Amino acid sequence: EKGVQVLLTTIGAFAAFGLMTIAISTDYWLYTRALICNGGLTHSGLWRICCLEGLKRGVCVKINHFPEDTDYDHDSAEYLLRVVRASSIFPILSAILLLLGGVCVAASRVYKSKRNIILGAGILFVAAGLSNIIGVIVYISANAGEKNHYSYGWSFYFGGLSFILAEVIGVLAVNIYIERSREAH
Amino acid sequence: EKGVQVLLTTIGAFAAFGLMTIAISTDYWLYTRALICNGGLTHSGLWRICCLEGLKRGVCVKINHFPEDTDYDHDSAEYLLRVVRASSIFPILSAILLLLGGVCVAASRVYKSKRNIILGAGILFVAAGLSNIIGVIVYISANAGEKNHYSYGWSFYFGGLSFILAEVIGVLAVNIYIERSREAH
Amino acid sequence: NRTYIVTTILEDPYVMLKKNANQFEGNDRYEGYCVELAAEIAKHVGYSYRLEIVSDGKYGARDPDTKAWNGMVGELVYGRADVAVAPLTITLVREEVIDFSKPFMSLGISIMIKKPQKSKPGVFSFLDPLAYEIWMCIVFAYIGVSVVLFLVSRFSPYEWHSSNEFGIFNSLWFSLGAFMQQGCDISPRSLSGRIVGGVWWFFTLIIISSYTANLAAFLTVERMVSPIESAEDLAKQTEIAYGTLEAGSTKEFFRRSKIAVFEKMWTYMKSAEPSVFVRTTEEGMIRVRKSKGKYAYLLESTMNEYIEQRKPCDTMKVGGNLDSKGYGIATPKGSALRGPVNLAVLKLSEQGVLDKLKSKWWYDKGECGSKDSGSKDKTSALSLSNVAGVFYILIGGLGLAMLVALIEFCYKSR
Amino acid sequence: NRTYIVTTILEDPYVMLKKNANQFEGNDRYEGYCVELAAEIAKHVGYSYRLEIVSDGKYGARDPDTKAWNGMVGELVYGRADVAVAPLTITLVREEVIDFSKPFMSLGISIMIKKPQKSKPGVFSFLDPLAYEIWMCIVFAYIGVSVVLFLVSRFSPYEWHSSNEFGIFNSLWFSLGAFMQQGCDISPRSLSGRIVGGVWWFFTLIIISSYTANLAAFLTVERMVSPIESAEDLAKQTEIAYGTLEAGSTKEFFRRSKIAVFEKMWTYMKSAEPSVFVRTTEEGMIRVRKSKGKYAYLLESTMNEYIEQRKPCDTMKVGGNLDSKGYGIATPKGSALRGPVNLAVLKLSEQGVLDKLKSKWWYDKGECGSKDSGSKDKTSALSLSNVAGVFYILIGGLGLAMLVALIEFCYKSR
Amino acid sequence: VVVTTILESPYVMMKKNHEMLEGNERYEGYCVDLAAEIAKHCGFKYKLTIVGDGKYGARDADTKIWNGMVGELVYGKADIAIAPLTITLVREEVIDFSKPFMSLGISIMIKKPQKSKPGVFSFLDPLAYEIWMCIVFAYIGVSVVLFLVSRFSPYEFGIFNSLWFSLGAFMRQGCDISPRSLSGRIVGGVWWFFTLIIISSYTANLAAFLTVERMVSPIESAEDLSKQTEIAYGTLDSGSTKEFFRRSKIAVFDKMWTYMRSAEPSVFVRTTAEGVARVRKSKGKYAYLLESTMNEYIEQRKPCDTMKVGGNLDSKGYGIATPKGSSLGTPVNLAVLKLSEQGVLDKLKNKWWYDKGECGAKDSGSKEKTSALSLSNVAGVFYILVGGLGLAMLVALIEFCYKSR
Amino acid sequence: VVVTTILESPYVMMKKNHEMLEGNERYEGYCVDLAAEIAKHCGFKYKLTIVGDGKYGARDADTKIWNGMVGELVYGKADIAIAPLTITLVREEVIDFSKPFMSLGISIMIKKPQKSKPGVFSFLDPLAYEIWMCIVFAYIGVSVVLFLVSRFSPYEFGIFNSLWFSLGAFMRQGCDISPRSLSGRIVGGVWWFFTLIIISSYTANLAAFLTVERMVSPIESAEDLSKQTEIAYGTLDSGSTKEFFRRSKIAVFDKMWTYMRSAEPSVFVRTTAEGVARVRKSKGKYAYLLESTMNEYIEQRKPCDTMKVGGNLDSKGYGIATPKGSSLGTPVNLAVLKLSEQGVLDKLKNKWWYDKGECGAKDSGSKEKTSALSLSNVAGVFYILVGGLGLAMLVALIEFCYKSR
Ligand SMILES: Oc1nc2ccc(-c3c(Cl)cccc3OC(F)(F)F)cc2[nH]1
Ligand SMILES: CCCCCCCCCCCCCCCC(=O)O
């Protein structure tokens, strides 16, 4: 309450925007073994795997997502998963929606008469969550194959907070639109 | 309606009383083979099995319910089932309750001022059903042992109607007690 | 040019008397795999042949006391025959006294079983996990529970003339909703009605879990059925019976067999009762058809395949061949006809001629056809045949509901 | 009276050097099954004995090139010994040159496996049928569904300022009730909220059926585990490895074995890698302990039982005895001591003396005891160990609820 | 030469062709096969012979003469006994035994553990009594905690309605009311989560109870047979087995002998066939103690109703016998071994017990099968139902009479 | 005397003790064992010999000379060839073959059908598309029938609320409303009964889908291999197998030859090892056509990744060879039969293929196992969920803009 509810919204969007962009471009998502090392430890990511021990240490190389196999351009479902996983459009989309939503909120402190601007931002913050939780199901389902052991890093959890924060600021932005409308009716 | 609701109640009790007593003392319940015949066809009952073909035909002999076995007086649950199945107290109880209930109803046409007499009869008609449906679970669970084929007769279904009729006249007797009470209040 | 004798035998389909042979004469009186083989052989070698059946009606055997060869082998050794195109299994005793060509058909012992039926699941098969008595006692207990609830909710004037909505009709509705794990718009408020509701709920929970679990057991067990696929499976198990033809050399192969498997089967064979063995192969066929999958005959591959394409096609060859043998063409010792015969048999074998004739006389004349026989969906997913009865019940209930709606409209209007 | 030599061997527990043998002297320097047997034998026969260990430290063998007997057999043939009370397996080569008494202990080859552990199910094992990712994605999807429902039910002023009860808190309540198949006091009335509710309901149905089915599969599979109970089970399967002592006569029994089973095991034995065999029986014991149930040693029954009653008792004898043999007392050819020795061994055998001594030195000195070893409940009913975590969750939730009730009271009062 | 023998299956049993074939081929069995390889190694001629008198051998307490098969060998009536004769002190003093060609021991015989008749309250079997007991306390605990929360910190949820809410949550039924506070909602959720696991656990394990049959014997040893008292056990009235328990000083077998004599009715029997039938008829309440070989043979014969359970209580063996001062003594002593290392005796053991076995020699012959649930399976919950309805009417009248007053 | 031979496992393979042991014991295999019994029957002396040139035998189209192992026998370099030589016309004209000691045929080789990667919308697998399709029509049918009943014969239950009631009944969730008429209640009950069967059927069959693994090959013959086009198949570039399809006039094998030459990329290979790897790498999209013996041997060798499927397309055999006019011709012709009836050749067949088999020779070596469900198993219903939420917000704005107008 007290009218600082907007400040929490725009603060959350900016942090939730950073915690997603930083998560994408940091490649400390997974911790596993893949035989590229010489398998050996890795701290992989959305784009590039990177060995951690052995002679190859501190050297990071792009992940293929298309090793030579008959399934390439053959399995409709498997290929489509690999297209979206390679592009990572869904996590990338999530950061875009938070950016637009934060702009709309900041563009609602000015043009303070309008209320439907805030409704857009609240929807974008909500739609960011759906893209985010889609962007992790794809990543998890893609990593699986066919008793190896893996672990999840801290860039993974950075994407997790961006879901929680985005869903919170969707609630507050709606509550703002509710409160604003009642004052106007 | 129209006050003949009592006539249906007492008519049902008298028929439901006959259809149960006749069912008990008729021994055309089951149709199976038991090796007493020479196994061969039977039309068994609650008390006496009776062959149907072979040299032994038209000769009916009591069912034992206690062939020589270690379970006699040893298995608490199995022995108790065999005590009640041999006595058939639950079906015999059901006909008694219908008889008392019909007497109470006939004793309510006279002493027409009272209403709590009818409530007793409605409860007895209901309690007859519970004893009846107990009296058939016992009979079915007792017949089983351990791919033979059996079939159920028409004295079985006579006990079935006594359940249906008894539960119907429990509804009508209660509805009478409801209608009588409202006229008095 | 001197015509040469052939000495076939009337075993099916190698030689068959034609549909109406009385008007026909000569070699055209007959047809079969062996007849066309002899035609091809005569074409390649360059002679002319005159077919014949052995008077004895048998293939070949050594008379022990008489020291005499019977059947076709006898007709070859004793100059009554120059060729033998029929199926003569290559053996040591036969090869000693006569010369065999290379085999034109390789075969062996095989297992013959009653074909699994379509196994139509049947309407009202979803009730199978629970007995008829359970369902009917559920119905009667539902009636009793509804009546008791109506009583203990509509007996007391102190809450009646004021109240409870639990009449008989709403009580039946409540019980029906409770049994299906669906809530209703009402719930008991008294202690009696609440006891009734709780115990009925417990009954419902137990019964539904029992249905689901037993159905899962049914489908799992029906999925793990391993059909017979070899002889070792028959050796390990003993539920399904199996036997041979006692007259023939099949029992000669089993009595003498030294491998652990076939020795085990031989020990089972004579010990069993009343008779796994059967006098004639037709009798074994119709016995396996009548046994309802409980008897497995043991037979040459060729007759098994032949029977598999003759009406009634309630039989199936299963597994591979236990042994390996070969039918072959025979000639007397030292005949000038040996070389051309063997070379022509091989030349036909590299060509598709023998395979063509086999496909002609086993499959093209298949009364029941092949259609890639034995293929199946091989899917355990439940099908509409399993759960058709509940759809029929739904349709009947909807029709009854519309009928009762019409009756309600008529009663209310007038 | 002339004292007689005995020539034991220090194999455990037949003869053991005492805990502190330096101060002790004579036959009291030693203890074991064989020592008490020799005491009883001397008592019955009526002589006095002086124990001895073979310098070579072995039982007996024929030197092929030297044509010499080693060990105790050598000490018996060459006059250095009058008796041999130690465990001497009865063989053809030994019995030719020396006289054996009747056996005082019958034995054979047996299977030694790592004892199955208690297998504590573990807290939070009811989550096993579904992966960690599924549970966490369920949580996040529940949050998303609740927020979306709150949005599409509390965004339109045309139904807001008038209305819907679906706030954020009631939306979370509705989603939580939906996931658990429990109804709530509210339900959506709009098209958007109804789409959300329906699809969430579908999700719930699929997920719960998956949990129940996979759990049923877990328990069923864990119930059908057939532990090893014989050698033919090891012959048929190949997942579990097994080997012998290569130095000893066990491999001498397996290389020469002619039965189909043991021939199959022998074929597996040498083919495998890196080495199923092991240099010493202690090494095989500790290897089976370390292998985590994946290696099964093959050993004499007596040492298997002995190891089964020594800490760490992580080992078990399984199945019966593959063969039958007998340890026995030996004497030189033509000795006057043969008859009394044999008769005394038998007289002890009909009495409980040998059984008493075996129970004394195998079980009464059992470091880990017996307590009717190997017994179990043998019940597949689920136990409180399996589902303890959900009770703990319930208790934690109740405590949190009471705490939040206190906080609510404090906030409302002041 | 004279191979004295006795007839007992599979050691010696008359061949079906007893009349047309005479002499050596007249008889057949395990011993019949064995004497061929003994004579093949030695070379001596032999003729199949049966002991005229059915006794094995013993000395009368008064006459002091040897009856039966051994009496043939003592008095020179024969020269060898390839027969199932136990090695014993009294028999060794007068004749010279071979080494044991088949090791032996007393064993236990039981009926095969069949699928028991399903009991009432069998529907509780998927969950142990600990879970059922702890479900109730949680049901009490949750309903109480909902009452305290709703009264101390209200927004009806009394005690009587809270017990209804928790019960309706356990059965997946529709609660008439729902909590409206946070503290009441936290209690409902964990209760709701608790049920979902428990119902699935019941349904899941029951599917295992019906899909897979796993029958475990009541006993696996003799310790388990002496401690308990439900199951009985007996031996032949005249035999070494009764004697072995009589003279035994071990605590467990002394404990048995107290039971055996204090038998009401008598545990003992006159012949092994009586003990077989008593096991085959007592339905798992009788355990016949005999030798390990009849039990192994009987286990592999029809109707295939019994099994040998546990280890062996005693160690003994059968041995070929020759008279005192026989040139045959050392060959047979050297021949049975030569068969034993070679593995011949194992092959004959398999031949006459396991191979030529009517029961399939393994459980693989049997296959899993299902049965539709019968009223006996779930009769306990009909009784619970009908019991509850009688209670409900009973409680209502109490309310009626109370309300009238 | 001179036993010409070639080295190919298990017929002849160099023994590990190639250096220290020389001569007959240098080599080992199926043929090596066989020549012992052939020479045991005949009695003649023999020495193990390898053909210097790896070819089996054929006549050059220009030179017209016999290469390889047969060229040894034509030109008198040896007298017998106990080796895997197919009986054929061109080889029979110049030398005299024995009878077939192992029957043969072209076969099919595939990768073992593995547990496939689970697909999205795999949660529908327990129920066929017919049931799912007919569930929807019933859902439409019930909701419609509830509307007509409630409007024509009222006591709200519109169309929009009736679709909600039926959906909430299918998911065992609490209906906000219930029918109050008899006709509306009859519709609800049968719908309620319908769901209870369907939900249990889904849950029951899924427990079978997870409890039991049942993998069926895509093909079981060659008809199924020619009709389809997803799976490929090839032969060696130079061999009889390519020739057999070339000259074949049967419709099915002529159909194959169209595919084989019209290969993009080439189906053919230069050696059998290439075809093995291509099957072991194509993940079930390649089917190598070869002889029935290598396939049986390979099926029993590590990594145990392939199987022989279907019957045999052609019938042929291997035969012992001798030169034209050899006294050895009739014994070997009479010896292989003597082995064949006695069953020796079967025992060697088991010895070198099945026994000494790395794969356990049966599925009993493998055991059932379970795996916790992963997100890939049930990702289809997360996508359906998140797809529905995006639809719900989309529909709401349409209502918003419409309501604004
Ligand atoms: O971009 C990203 N979006 C996300 C959403 C959730 C999680 C997550 C967390 Cl926060 C804890 C535990 C498991 C998790 O993964 C899950 F999908 F839930 F299994 C990680 C994420 N990363
Ligand atoms: C009431 C509206 C229509 C919805 C009900 C659809 C009824 C479908 C019943 C089809 C049962 C199929 C029986 C044939 C079995 C088969 O398809 O092979």
Author numbering:
A (entry chain I), B (entry chain J): 16 to 53, 79 to 186, 196 to 234
C (entry chain A), D (entry chain C): 388 to 549, 564 to 815
E (entry chain D), F (entry chain B): 395 to 549, 570 to 819
Give verbatim lines from the article.
To understand and compare the binding modalities of these compounds, we obtained cryo-EM structures of each NAM with resting-state GluA1/2 receptors, containing two γ8 subunits at the preferred B’D’ sites (by tethering γ8 to GluA2). All three NAMs anchor between these two γ8 residues through a common oxindole isostere secured by a H-bond between γ8 Asn172 and an amine of the oxindole, consistent with our recent docking study, and replicating a previously reported binding mode of JNJ-11840. While oxindole groups are shared, and their binding modes analogous, the remainder of each compound is variable. These variable moieties project towards the top of the GluA1 M1 helix, increasing the distance between M1 and the TARP-γ8 M4 helix, and triggering side chain reorientations of Tyr519, Met523 and Phe527. In the JNJ-118 structure, the top of the binding site is capped by Tyr519, which points towards γ8 Tyr206, comparable to ligand-free structures. In the JNJ-118 structure, L1 arches above Tyr519, effectively capping the binding pocket. Mutation of Met523 (M523A) essentially blunted NAM action of both JNJ-118 and JNJ-059 but not of LY-481. At this position, all NAMs break the GluA1 Met523 interaction with γ8 Phe205, and force the Met523 side chain into lipid; the lipid interactions induced may contribute to negative modulation, and are lost by mutation to the shorter alanine side chain (M523A). JNJ-059 also failed to reduce the GluA2_γ8 equilibrium current, but still abolished resensitization. This behaviour was not seen with JNJ-118, which acted as a NAM on GluA2 for all measures, consistent with a recent study.
